[model samples]
Target: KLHKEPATLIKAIDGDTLKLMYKGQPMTFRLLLVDTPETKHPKKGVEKYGPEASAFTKKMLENAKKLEVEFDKGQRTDKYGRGLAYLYADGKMLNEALVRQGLAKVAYVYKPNNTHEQHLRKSEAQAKKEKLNIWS
Candidate 1:
């Protein structure tokens, strides 16, 4: 069960968020490892590059026809019913992609799942070196 044929991406919420059709249910997925600024948080308000982040996510997922999800050892629910899992597409992990592109930072809400944490650290470092979204 390493790969499931993904349905079309229904919508992009932000550079690290997405709505998609999975198993006939509209699934909302937050890219693992990456944390974008709070755009919809009532207290924090939208952070810088919020719109750009959303747009970038849209661009990456607009035409994606297949997706892959990797299960982790964390709790399945985040107090809400949204399924929490690592997502991938086109040979790339969505979490790694966001950080690699500088669209997001690694989220600390969950502990390291394994070497993915290391990959995320490298990705973030490279992103900072290149000054992707955080720069402009």
Candidate 2:
């Protein structure tokens, strides 16, 4: 089961990781069904279009007062301790938004995490077709 939780946008760590205040405690989330370019890579340094993805994410979250997060029951974080969830802001989904802007690709396509996979892939396809931002 999935339920929506209310949270305040703390910061946009990157295109995927997000910092938020939920349940009076700080929470970190990794957006499900999307992966953006690497803004900071320890081995390779900054990747292409990484900054653009971060900026797009920052701008999207910064303007929203509240963010809605939904996670499947029994969710677990990776080694980085980032909980997997779907993020929504201002009546729109950030996962879809990033792909639509060509700033991210639909990724992490596994059985349990396939909630928005098709929608994200469609957005990614259109972005590639338009050659927008990162796609260009």
Candidate 3:
């Protein structure tokens, strides 16, 4: 089993990024195995379905009764020092939800950090089949 750490939501920075209160300090978490539409890009402004995706994440995180972070066997931080982990809100994996809704795509795949790759891929397949949101 992966090491799961409990966390608290400060905010959803975007669809795929979260500002969390973990271990008594504020930290940024980059959701592993998924990438959402760009909402905070200076050059891109807002991509298609960006607002919807952000809203979806924000609503879920804000309403989550409990939050958890589980890391894989690979690196723990990105270049920006943000924590890399699989986010769980009330026992549901947030990464899979975004992809399942077509609000995000399976991305940033790297070796050893793919503990949940199959789960994400399955969600993407369902979203692609349904042509939901970004997939449309």
Candidate 4:
């Protein structure tokens, strides 16, 4: 099992990133194993379905009764030092939800840090089969 920690949602920066209070301190968390369309990217501006992705993430967290972060068995930090974790809101994984809805794609897979890769890929397959949003 992975390490789990309680988190309080402070903000949903975009689709794949969040600002949360962890251990009484604020931190940025980049969702692991998923990449959503860019909403606030300087160069990308607003990609197709970016707003929808952001909306989904914001709504889920805002309405969740509980929030938690789970760490993979490998590296815990990204290049940006944002905590790389799987976000759980009300016990459902937001990473899988994003991909299952085609709001995000499975990416950035690195050895040992790919604990949830299969689960994410399965979600991606279903999303692809349905041709939802990003897939469409």
Could you say which candidate leads in lDDT? 4
- Compose the digit string of candidate 3's lDDT tens values, residues 1-136: 6988999998888998889999999999999989999997899899999999999999888988999999989999999999999998899999899999999999969998999999889989999999999989
Model 3 compared with the native: what TM-score?
Answer: 0.97
Q: What is the lDDT of residue 32 in candidate 2?
A: 86
Model 1: which ten-residue window has the lowest total lDDT? 1-10
Per-residue lDDT of candidate 1, residues 75-127 (tens digit): 54455565566677776677787778877888785654333788788989998
Q: How do the residues 1-136 of candidate 2 rate in per-residue lDDT, one tens digit apiece?
A: 6777788888888878888887788878898888899977888877888888898889988998668888754455667888788888876888899999998988857676676778889899999999998788
Candidate 2 regions exceeding 4 Å error are: 73-76
| lDDT agreement with native, every candidate | 0.69, 0.84, 0.92, 0.93
**TM-score, candidate number 1:** 0.81
On a 0 to 100 scale, what is the lDDT of residue 92 in model 2? 86
Number of backbone-clashing residue pairs for each candidate, in the order shown: 1, 0, 0, 0
lDDT of 1 at 9: 77
What stretches of model 4 exceed 4 Å from their correct place?
none
Cα lDDT for residue 58, candidate 1: 75
